[model samples]
Target: MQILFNDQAMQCAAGQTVHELLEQLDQRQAGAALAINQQIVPREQWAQHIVQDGDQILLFQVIAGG
Candidate 1:
Protein backbone atom coordinates (compact mmCIF):
# COMPACT_ATOMS: atom_id res chain seq x y z
CA MET A 1 0.00 0.00 0.00
CA GLN A 2 1.09 3.54 -0.67
CA ILE A 3 0.94 6.26 1.98
CA LEU A 4 2.41 9.66 2.62
CA PHE A 5 5.08 9.86 5.27
CA ASN A 6 5.69 13.45 6.23
CA ASP A 7 4.45 14.47 2.77
CA GLN A 8 6.70 12.02 0.92
CA ALA A 9 5.38 9.00 -0.92
CA MET A 10 6.25 5.62 0.56
CA GLN A 11 5.11 2.07 0.12
CA CYS A 12 4.62 -0.75 2.56
CA ALA A 13 3.23 -4.24 2.53
CA ALA A 14 -0.50 -4.78 2.89
CA GLY A 15 -2.10 -4.79 6.34
CA GLN A 16 0.90 -3.10 7.94
CA THR A 17 0.44 -1.53 11.35
CA VAL A 18 2.16 1.56 12.66
CA HIS A 19 4.45 -0.49 14.86
CA GLU A 20 5.62 -2.61 11.94
CA LEU A 21 6.10 0.44 9.77
CA LEU A 22 8.20 2.02 12.46
CA GLU A 23 10.37 -1.07 12.54
CA GLN A 24 10.69 -1.10 8.78
CA LEU A 25 11.75 2.54 8.88
CA ASP A 26 14.19 1.82 11.74
CA GLN A 27 12.33 4.29 13.95
CA ARG A 28 11.23 2.01 16.76
CA GLN A 29 13.57 3.46 19.33
CA ALA A 30 13.05 7.12 18.71
CA GLY A 31 10.77 9.23 20.84
CA ALA A 32 8.17 10.30 18.34
CA ALA A 33 4.53 11.20 18.00
CA LEU A 34 2.32 10.25 15.09
CA ALA A 35 -0.79 11.63 13.50
CA ILE A 36 -2.60 9.60 10.87
CA ASN A 37 -5.00 11.41 8.64
CA GLN A 38 -4.77 14.32 11.04
CA GLN A 39 -5.69 12.31 14.13
CA ILE A 40 -3.31 11.60 16.94
CA VAL A 41 -2.67 7.95 17.72
CA PRO A 42 -1.69 7.13 21.25
CA ARG A 43 1.61 5.39 21.87
CA GLU A 44 -0.05 2.38 23.42
CA GLN A 45 -2.15 1.86 20.31
CA TRP A 46 0.65 1.95 17.75
CA ALA A 47 0.67 -1.82 17.38
CA GLN A 48 -3.01 -1.85 16.59
CA HIS A 49 -3.14 1.23 14.41
CA ILE A 50 -3.48 0.06 10.85
CA VAL A 51 -2.31 2.34 8.07
CA GLN A 52 -4.43 2.44 4.96
CA ASP A 53 -3.77 3.52 1.39
CA GLY A 54 -3.58 7.23 0.65
CA ASP A 55 -3.29 7.93 4.32
CA GLN A 56 -1.34 10.95 5.42
CA ILE A 57 1.06 10.40 8.28
CA LEU A 58 3.04 12.97 10.18
CA LEU A 59 5.85 11.85 12.45
CA PHE A 60 7.23 14.33 14.93
CA GLN A 61 10.24 13.55 17.04
CA VAL A 62 10.27 14.68 20.63
CA ILE A 63 13.27 16.72 21.65
CA ALA A 64 14.82 17.72 24.92
CA GLY A 65 15.56 21.35 25.65
CA GLY A 66 17.45 23.12 28.36
Candidate 2:
Protein backbone atom coordinates (compact mmCIF):
# COMPACT_ATOMS: atom_id res chain seq x y z
CA MET A 1 0.00 0.00 0.00
CA GLN A 2 1.14 3.54 -0.73
CA ILE A 3 1.44 5.90 2.23
CA LEU A 4 3.22 9.09 3.20
CA PHE A 5 5.40 9.52 6.23
CA ASN A 6 6.60 13.02 6.89
CA ASP A 7 5.87 14.01 3.28
CA GLN A 8 7.72 11.01 1.91
CA ALA A 9 5.93 8.25 0.06
CA MET A 10 6.59 4.76 1.34
CA GLN A 11 5.13 1.30 0.99
CA CYS A 12 3.18 0.06 3.98
CA ALA A 13 2.09 -3.48 4.60
CA ALA A 14 -1.49 -4.38 5.35
CA GLY A 15 -2.77 -4.26 8.96
CA GLN A 16 0.19 -2.16 10.07
CA THR A 17 -0.68 0.43 12.68
CA VAL A 18 0.86 3.89 12.90
CA HIS A 19 2.84 2.83 15.95
CA GLU A 20 4.15 -0.30 14.24
CA LEU A 21 5.27 1.52 11.15
CA LEU A 22 6.98 4.31 13.05
CA GLU A 23 8.62 1.85 15.40
CA GLN A 24 9.87 -0.15 12.42
CA LEU A 25 11.50 2.99 11.03
CA ASP A 26 12.86 3.85 14.47
CA GLN A 27 10.90 7.05 14.42
CA ARG A 28 8.46 6.20 17.17
CA GLN A 29 9.52 9.02 19.44
CA ALA A 30 8.07 8.74 22.88
CA GLY A 31 4.93 10.82 23.45
CA ALA A 32 4.33 11.26 19.76
CA ALA A 33 0.86 11.70 18.38
CA LEU A 34 -0.70 10.13 15.28
CA ALA A 35 -3.43 11.20 12.97
CA ILE A 36 -5.07 9.32 10.12
CA ASN A 37 -5.94 11.77 7.35
CA GLN A 38 -6.89 14.62 9.66
CA GLN A 39 -8.55 13.08 12.68
CA ILE A 40 -6.45 12.46 15.76
CA VAL A 41 -6.15 8.83 16.80
CA PRO A 42 -6.20 8.36 20.52
CA ARG A 43 -3.30 6.63 22.21
CA GLU A 44 -5.53 3.82 23.41
CA GLN A 45 -6.50 3.09 19.80
CA TRP A 46 -2.99 3.07 18.35
CA ALA A 47 -2.64 -0.70 18.61
CA GLN A 48 -5.93 -1.37 16.84
CA HIS A 49 -5.85 1.45 14.31
CA ILE A 50 -5.02 -0.41 11.16
CA VAL A 51 -3.45 1.19 8.14
CA GLN A 52 -5.08 0.52 4.80
CA ASP A 53 -4.26 1.01 1.14
CA GLY A 54 -3.90 4.64 0.17
CA ASP A 55 -4.28 5.67 3.79
CA GLN A 56 -2.40 8.71 5.00
CA ILE A 57 -0.88 8.34 8.42
CA LEU A 58 0.78 11.33 9.97
CA LEU A 59 3.12 10.97 12.93
CA PHE A 60 4.00 13.92 15.11
CA GLN A 61 6.31 13.87 18.07
CA VAL A 62 5.44 15.84 21.16
CA ILE A 63 8.30 18.27 21.34
CA ALA A 64 8.36 21.33 23.52
CA GLY A 65 8.91 24.48 21.53
CA GLY A 66 7.76 28.00 21.35
Candidate that would win on TM-score: 1
Candidate 2 has a TM-score of 0.71
lDDT of 2 by residue, 15-63 (tens): 7776666665566556777677777777556667777766576766774
lDDT of 1 by residue, 1-66 (tens): 877778877877546778866665556736777787889787556688877766567887773336
Candidate 1's C-alpha runs over 4 A off are 63-66
How many clashes does each candidate structure show, in the order listed?
Answer: 0, 0
Q: Against the hidden reference, what TM-scores do the models get?
A: 0.77, 0.71
Evaluated with lDDT, which candidate comes out highest? 1
Worst ten-residue run, lDDT, model 2? Answer: 20-29
lDDT of 2: 0.68
The 0-to-1 C-alpha lDDT of every candidate, in the order given, reads: 0.71, 0.68
Ten residues in sequence with the least summed lDDT for candidate 1: 21-30
- Once model 2 is optimally superposed onto the true structure by TM-score, how far is the C-alpha of residue 33 displaced, in angstroms? 0.2
